[PDB]
Design a protein around this ligand. Structure first.
Ligand SMILES: CCCCCCCCCCCCCCCCCC(=O)OC[C@H](COP(=O)([O-])OCC(O)COP(=O)([O-])OC[C@@H](COC(=O)CCCCCCCCCCCCCCCCC)OC(=O)CCCCCCCCCCCCCCCCC)OC(=O)CCCCCCCCCCCCCCCCC
Ligand SMILES: CCCCCCCCCCCCCCCCCC(=O)OC[C@H](COP(=O)(O)OCCN)OC(=O)CCCCCCCCCCCCCCCCC
Ligand SMILES: CCCCCCCCCCCC(=O)OC[C@H](COP(=O)(O)OCC[N+](C)(C)C)OC(=O)CCCCCCCCCCC
Lengths: 54, 106, 71, 85, 44, 52, 246, 124, 83, 163
C-alpha cells in the first residue's frame, strides 16, 4: 500500500469551465439541428440578415 | 622521469589500474581475465627497477602506446555514474522557495 | 475444367489466382469462409488445390526443360 | 529495497582483505590499519586492492581519489560516502 | 600464481559448476517426452 | 548475505515460478514435438514436385 | 505482413524479459558482461527469454518459423534471377541472428557469475504484474503462427485482398521449385550454430577472447554501429551547424 | 583556436578573449563543477563558437578519427555492394517456366483493350 | 525509494507520487464520466457506420460505367495504351 | 455497441483522462483505469477480427469534412479491413500487455500518471494511423506517434542523454 497525498476535489474550476462550455456547445448544436428539422431552418440562421445580393 | 618518485608512482599506478580496467573490458570470460591480469602484473613487475632515464622514459612511452592500441570502444561503467544508464535519472529537485517577480501578480 | 470468365468474375477471384485450376480454388475459399480459416479444416479442398498446382508447376518445368534442350 | 550499513561495509572490506594472498597476516587487519605500513602492501598491490573494492561495491573510483585512501578506515568512510554502492 | 585466487573460488563452486550451471536449461523436457510418447500411443 | 567470498546457497525460488517454468517448458517442447511429427515430410523436404 | 504480426509478439516478449533481468540486479546494470550465472536464480525469466529467442531463430514448430523461413525461401523462389544473391544475404543474417541470441542467453544464464556476491544473494524474480504479460506473450509466441498460417500464407487465401500483378505472383513457385538443400540449410545452420556458440563459450573461451590487434579493430567497427553514428554526427550534423554559423 | 571555423573568426574579435575550445563532453566527469550536468564553472570564459562545444552540442566520438571512420563506412558499403553485384553473375538458372494465364494473359481482366494488349496483359 | 519534493509545484498530472486521500471517490466520478462518454460516442456515430460491399446494386454500377463510356464517346477518348 | 467507434474512442479516453484528472485521481487509479480501457479495446478488436474472418465486409466510419477546396476533398474516414485488423491485433495486444507490465516495472517511479497517459497516447495515435481510409488520416497518426515518441524517450527529463 502506497502513501496518501491530501484529498483534492474532483471538479476544479477548469473542469467545470471547459466541460460546461463544450457540453453546452454540443447541446446547442443538437437543439439547432432539431429546431431545423421541425421549423425548416436552423435557429441560428434566423439572426442572419444580410443585404440582398442585388 | 625519476626512477623512483611520488610522481612516478602515481603515474605507474594510474596506468596499471588502466591496464586492469582494459583487460576486464576486453575479456568476457572471468577465468581468462584472471589469467591476463596475472600476466599484466608480471609485465609490470619485470620492468620495475629501470634506473637510467632514457630506458624508463622509453618503456613508459611504449606502454602508453600499448594501452592506446588496446583501448576499448565502450568500457563498463556502473549505471549510477557519468557514463551510466541511470546517471541523472530522477534527480531529486532542489528544495527552494518561490521568489516573487511582480508586486500585483504571483 | 477452365472456369467461365463470367464465373471467374462472379466468384471474385483475385487476378493472380485466375488459372486453369481456379475451379478448385472456389470451393476451397468457400470452406475457408465457413470455417474461420482454421488450420485443421479444409484439408480435402486445400489438398486438391495443391495437387492442381503440382500439375501446373510440372508442366512448366517440362516447358523449361524443352526450352533448355533447344539451346 | 537493499541498504548497506557502516558495519556491513567494514565486514565486506575485512573479508576482502582476508582473501588477499599478498598480505602479511590476516589477524592484524584493523579498521585503522595502514595497507602500506601494517599489511606491507606494495605500490601496485594497493591498486589491486582498490580495484577489488570497486569491483565489490559496484562503484567507480577516480585516479585522484583512489591514491588518496591509505587506511582501511579511509576506504570505509569513502564507500559510505557514496550513495549508490 | 593468483593472489586473489581465494576471492574467485565461489564463482566456480556449487551453484556455478558445469553440472549445476547447465541444470534446468530444458525445463519440462521430461514431461514432454512422456507426453509425446503417450500421444504416440493414443493416436494409434 | 551471511557468507562472503564463500560458496553460495541454493537460490530460493517461489513454488509458483517453478510450476510456471515447468508448464511453459513442457508446453513448448511438446508443441515442437507435435509439429515435427505432423510436418516431417514438408518441413524436412520430401516428395519432390518435379517429374521423375 | 505475417512476419510483422509474428515478430511483434516475440519481440515484445524479449524486451519485457530483458526488463525483468535488469530489475533483478541491485545495480540495475544492462551490460551483458556484468551478469553471468543467473539460470538458477531466475528460471522463469530464463524460460520466457528462451521461448522468445527460439521463436526468433525460427526453430521448428514455433511462430517465427512460419514467417522467417518462408520469407527466406521466397527470395530463392522469386522469378527475378539476381534475387538469388538476396537468399545468401538473408541466410547469413539468419545465422548471425542465432549468434547474438545465444550470446545473450549464455552470458546471462550459463556463463559463470561476473557480478559481486551481494547481487546474487539479492537476485530474485519480479512481481505478478511483470510475470503475467510474459506468460501471455509466451503462449502467443508459441501458438499464434501455427494457428494463423492459413489466413496469411494460404494457397489461395483471399483475406488480404491486395491486387498482385499475376506476372509477379510467385508464392507457388517458391514452394514447388525449392530443393531440400535450400529448404533445410537455414534450419540446420541455425541449430548447429546455436550449439557451436554455446560449446565454444563453455570450452574454448580463447577463440572469442583473443587479443589480435586487427580483430579488435574490426570488432570496434561493429561495436560502434558501423561507425554510422560518428559519420552522421561529424559529416552531416556538425558540418550543418558550421554552415549555419557561416 | 583549434578548428578552421574558430580560426576564421580571429579577425572578428577585438578585445574578446581568444579561447582555445574543448568539447564539454570530453571534460572528465569526476571533477566538480558548479553546473555538474554542463561541466561548467561560474565565470568560465566562453569561446566564440561555444555553442558548438557545450554539452548540448552533437556528440563526438573518440575511438576512431573521423577520417578513418569515413574510410571504414565507405569500405563496408563498397565491399557489400560490390560483392552482391559480382555474385549476381555466378547465379544458377531456374528450372520451371514462369506461369501463364488464359485469355492472352487476362488482358481484359486487368483493364486492357483489343487495341492495347501490350500495356495490360500477362504472359499468356 | 522516495525523496523530498516542492509541495507548491502544481501540475495537472499530479506531480510526485500523486495519491490523493479521496482517490476512490474521485475514481468513481471519473469512471462514470468515461462510461457516459464512450456510450454517447458509440451511439452517436452509429448512423455514420456502414459496410463496404453490397451497398450499391449491380444496376447502378453497370449503368454508371455505361454512362461514362457514353461521355467518353461524345468526346474523342481513346483508352490508355490505345494508339 | 459499434466496434470501430469504441476501438477509436477508448484509447482516446485512456490518453486524455489522466491528463485532465491526474492530480485528482492518482497513479493507482490511473494505472488500473488505463490498463482496463486498453484491455477492453483489445477484446473488441479480437471479436471484430473473428467476425471479419467470418465475413470479409469491412466496416467504414465516415465523419465530418476536413477540406473541401477546389478539387481536394479530404474527410475523417476510417475503415477496418484485413490489413488494418492485422495491425490492430499487434497494436492492441502488445499495448495491453505493456500497460499491465508497467504497473510493476514503474511502481517506484514518481511520475506514473504522465507515463501511462503517454503509453495510451501512443496507442490511440497508432490506431488512428492504421484505421484511416486516406493518406491524410495516416499522416495525422504518423506525426502524432512521432510527438509521443519524443515525449516517451525523454520521459526522464533531467537526464541529458535521454533528451
Ligand atoms: C466541442 C466543443 C469545443 C469547442 C471549444 C470549447 C473550449 C472551451 C474553453 C473554455 O472552457 O473556456 C476557457 C477560456 C479561458 O480559459 P481558462 O480556463 O479560464 O484559463 C484560465 C486557467 O487556466 C483556468 O484555471 P487553471 O489555471 O487552474 O487551469 C490549468 C490549465 C492547465 O494547464 C496547462 O498546462 C494547459 C495546457 C494547455 C491546454 C490548452 C489546450 C486545450 C486543449 C483542449 C483539450 C484537447 C483534447 C484533445 C482533442 C479532443 C477533441 C475534443 O487548465 C486548462 O486551461 C486546460 C483545461 C482542459 C480541460 C479539459 C477537461 C474537459 C472535461 C471533459 C469532460 C467530458 C464530459 C463527458 C460527459 C459525457 C456524458 C454523456 O474562456 C473561453 O471560453 C474562451 C472562448 C474560446 C472559444 C473557442 C474560440 C473559438 C473562436 C476562435 C476563432 C474561431 C476560429 C478562428 C477564425 C479566425 C478568423 C476567421
Ligand atoms: C490534440 C490536443 C491534445 C492537447 C492535450 C491537452 C493536455 C492537457 C494536460 C497536459 C498536462 C501535461 C503536464 O502537465 O505535464 C507536465 C510535465 C510535468 O508533470 P509531472 O510528471 O506531473 O511532474 C514532473 C516534475 N514535476 O511536464 C512535461 O514533462 C511536459 C510534457 C507535456 C505533455 C503534453 C501532452 C500533449 C502533447 C501533444 C501536443 C501536440 C501539440 C499540437
Ligand atoms: C473527440 C474524439 C472524436 C469524437 C467524435 C464523436 C462524433 C459524434 C457525433 C459526430 C457528428 C459529426 O461529426 O457531424 C459533423 C457535423 C455535420 O456533418 P455531416 O456532413 O452532416 O456528416 C458527417 C459524416 N458524413 C459527411 C460522412 C456524412 O458538422 C460539425 O459538427 C462540424 C462543426 C465544426 C465545429 C468547429 C470545430 C470544433 C473542434 C473542437 C476541438 C476541441
Amino acid at each position: 500500500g502506497p502513501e496518501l497525498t491530501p484529498a483534492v476535489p474532483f471538479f476544479q474550476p477548469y473542469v467545470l469551465k471547459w466541460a460546461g462550455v463544450s457540453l453546452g456547445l454540443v447541446a446547442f448544436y443538437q437543439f439547432n439541428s432539431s429546431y431545423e428539422a421541425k421549423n425548416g431552418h436552423t435557429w441560428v440562421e434566423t439572426f442572419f440578415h444580410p443585404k440582398s445580393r442585388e | 622521469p625519476v626512477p623512483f618518485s611520488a610522481a612516478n608512482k602515481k603515474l605507474v599506478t594510474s596506468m596499471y589500474r588502466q591496464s586492469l580496467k582494459l583487460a576486464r573490458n576486453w575479456i568476457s570470460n572471468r577465468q581468462l581475465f584472471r589469467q591476463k591480469a596475472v600476466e599484466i602484473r608480471h609485465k609490470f613487475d619485470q620492468n620495475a627497477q629501470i634506473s637510467n632515464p632514457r630506458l624508463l622514459a622509453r618503456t613508459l612511452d611504449e606502454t602508453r602506446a600499448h594501452l592506446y592500441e588496446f583501448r576499448h570502444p565502450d568500457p563498463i561503467v556502473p549505471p549510477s555514474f557519468p557514463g551510466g544508464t541511470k546517471y541523472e535519472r530522477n534527480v531529486p529537485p532542489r528544495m527552494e522557495k518561490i521568489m516573487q517577480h511582480n508586486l500585483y501578480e504571483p | 475444367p477452365l472456369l467461365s470468365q463470367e464465373d471467374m468474375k462472379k466468384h471474385k477471384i483475385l487476378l493472380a489466382y485466375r488459372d486453369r485450376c481456379a475451379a478448385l480454388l472456389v470451393p476451397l475459399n468457400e470452406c475457408r469462409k465457413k470455417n474461420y480459416y482454421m488450420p485443421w479444416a479444409c484439408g480435402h479442398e486445400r489438398h486438391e488445390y495443391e495437387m492442381c498446382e503440382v500439375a501446373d508447376f510440372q508442366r512448366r518445368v517440362k516447358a523449361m526443360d524443352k526450352l533448355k534442350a533447344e539451346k | 529495497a537493499h541498504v548497506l550499513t557502516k558495519d556491513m561495509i567494514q565486514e565486506r572490506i575485512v573479508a576482502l582483505l582476508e582473501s588477499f594472498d599478498k598480505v602479511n597476516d590476516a589477524k592484524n587487519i584493523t579498521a585503522t590499519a595502514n595497507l602500506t605500513s601494517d599489511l606491507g602492501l606494495d605500490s601496485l598491490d594497493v591498486v589491486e586492492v582498490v580495484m577489488a573494492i570497486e569491483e565489490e561495491f559496484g562503484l567507480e573510483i577516480p585516479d585522484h581519489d583512489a591514491d588518496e585512501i591509505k587506511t582501511v578506515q579511509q576506504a570505509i568512510d569513502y564507500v559510505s560516502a557514496q550513495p549508490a554502492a | 600464481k593468483d593472489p586473489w585466487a581465494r576471492r574467485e573460488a565461489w564463482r566456480y563452486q556449487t551453484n556455478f559448476t558445469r553440472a549445476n550451471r547447465f541444470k534446468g536449461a530444458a525445463p519440462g523436457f521430461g514431461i514432454a517426452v512422456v507426453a509425446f510418447g503417450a500421444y504416440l500411443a493414443a493416436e494409434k | 548475505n551471511y557468507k562472503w567470498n564463500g560458496p553460495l546457497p541454493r537460490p530460493h525460488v517461489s513454488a509458483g515460478h517453478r510450476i510456471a517454468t515447468k508448464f511453459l517448458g513442457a508446453t513448448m517442447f511438446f508443441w515442437m514435438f507435435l509439429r515435427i511429427k505432423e510436418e516431417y515430410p514438408a518441413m524436412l523436404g520430401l516428395h519432390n514436385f518435379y517429374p521423375p | 505482413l505475417f512476419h510483422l504480426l509474428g515478430h511483434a509478439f516475440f519481440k515484445a516478449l524479449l524486451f519485457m524479459s530483458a526488463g525483468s533481468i535488469i530489475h533483478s540486479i541491485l545495480n540495475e546494470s544492462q551490460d551483458i558482461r556484468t551478469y553471468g550465472g543467473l539460470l538458477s536464480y531466475l528460471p522463469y525469466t530464463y524460460i520466457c527469454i528462451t521461448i522468445a529467442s527460439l521463436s526468433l531463430m525460427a526453430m521448428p514448430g514455433l511462430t517465427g518459423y512460419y514467417t522467417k523461413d518462408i520469407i527466406i525461401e521466397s527470395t530463392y523462389g522469386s522469378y527475378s534471377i539476381s534475387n538469388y544473391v538476396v537468399y545468401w544475404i538473408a541466410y547469413l543474417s539468419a545465422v548471425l541472428t542465432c549468434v547474438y541470441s545465444m550470446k545473450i542467453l549464455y552470458l546471462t544464464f550459463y556463463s559463470n557469475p561476473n557480478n559481486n556476491t551481494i547481487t546474487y544473494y539479492n537476485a530474485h524474480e519480479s512481481n505478478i504484474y511483470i510475470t503475467l504479460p510474459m506468460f501471455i506473450l509466451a503462449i502467443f509466441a508459441m501458438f499464434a503462427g501455427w494457428i494463423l498460417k492459413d489466413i496469411y500464407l494460404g494457397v489461395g487465401t483471399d483475406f488480404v485482398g491486395t491486387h498482385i500483378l499475376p506476372n509477379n505472383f510467385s508464392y507457388f513457385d517458391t514452394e514447388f521449385s525449392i530443393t531440400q538443400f535450400y529448404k533445410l540449410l537455414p534450419l540446420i545452420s541455425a541449430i548447429l550454430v546455436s550449439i557451436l556458440i554455446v560449446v565454444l563459450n563453455e570450452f574454448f573461451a580463447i577463440v572469442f577472447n583473443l587479443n589480435n590487434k586487427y580483430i579488435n579493430t574490426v570488432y570496434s567497427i561493429f561495436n560502434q554501429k558501423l561507425v554510422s553514428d560518428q559519420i552522421l554526427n561529424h559529416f552531416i550534423i556538425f558540418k550543418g551547424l558550421v554552415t549555419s554559423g557561416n | 583556436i583549434r578548428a578552421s571555423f574558430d580560426k576564421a573568426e580571429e579577425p572578428m574579435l577585438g578585445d574578446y578573449p581568444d579561447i582555445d575550445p574543448f568539447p564539454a563532453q570530453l571534460k572528465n566527469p569526476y571533477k566538480k563543477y558548479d553546473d555538474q550536468q554542463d561541466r561548467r564553472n561560474l565565470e568560465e570564459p566562453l569561446s566564440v563558437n561555444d555553442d558548438l562545444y557545450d554539452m548540448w552540442s552533437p556528440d563526438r566520438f573518440t575511438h576512431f578519427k573521423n577520417q578513418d571512420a569515413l574510410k571504414y563506412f565507405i569500405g563496408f558499403l563498397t565491399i557489400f555492394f560490390g560483392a552482391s553485384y559480382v555474385a549476381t553473375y555466378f547465379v544458377p538458372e531456374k528450372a520451371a517456366i514462369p506461369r501463364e494465364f488464359p485469355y492472352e494473359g487476362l488482358w481484359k481482366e486487368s483493364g486492357g483493350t483489343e487495341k492495347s494488349k501490350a500495356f495490360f496483359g500477362q504472359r499468356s | 525509494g522516495r525523496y523530498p519534493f516542492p509541495k507548491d509545484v502544481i501540475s495537472m498530472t499530479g506531480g510526485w507520487w500523486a495519491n490523493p486521500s479521496n482517490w476512490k471517490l474521485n475514481g468513481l466520478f471519473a469512471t462514470g464520466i468515461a462510461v457516459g462518454l464512450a456510450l454517447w460516442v458509440s451511439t452517436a456515430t452509429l448512423p455514420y457506420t456502414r459496410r463496404r460491399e453490397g451497398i450499391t446494386s449491380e444496376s447502378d454500377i453497370s449503368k454508371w460505367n455505361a454512362a461514362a463510356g457514353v461521355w467518353r464517346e461524345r468526346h474523342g477518348k481513346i483508352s490508355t495504351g490505345e494508339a | 455497441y459499434n466496434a470501430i467507434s469504441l476501438i477509436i474512442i477508448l484509447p482516446c479516453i485512456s490518453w486524455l483522462f489522466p491528463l485532465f484528472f491526474g492530480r485528482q485521481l492518482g497513479y493507482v487509479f490511473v494505472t488500473r483505469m488505463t490498463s482496463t480501457l486498453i484491455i477492453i479495446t483489445t477484446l473488441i478488436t479480437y471479436y471484430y477480427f473473428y467476425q471479419l474472418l467470418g465475413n470479409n465486409n469491412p466496416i467504414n466510419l465516415e465523419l465530418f469534412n476536413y477540406l473541401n477546396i477546389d478539387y481536394l476533398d479530404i474527410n475523417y474516414n476510417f475503415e477496418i479491413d484485413a490489413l488494418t485488423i492485422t495491425m490492430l491485433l499487434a497494436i492492441t495486444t502488445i499495448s495491453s500487455m505493456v500497460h499491465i507490465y508497467s504497473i510493476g516495472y514503474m511502481e517506484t517511479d514518481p511520475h506514473q500518471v504522465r507515463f501511462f497517459s503517454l503509453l495510451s497516447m501512443f496507442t490511440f495515435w497508432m490506431i488512428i494511423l492504421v484505421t484511416g481510409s486516406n493518406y491524410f488520416v495516416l499522416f495525422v497518426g504518423w506525426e502524432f506517434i512521432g510527438v509521443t515518441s519524443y515525449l516517451l524517450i525523454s520521459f526522464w527529463v533531467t537526464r541529458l542523454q535521454a533528451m
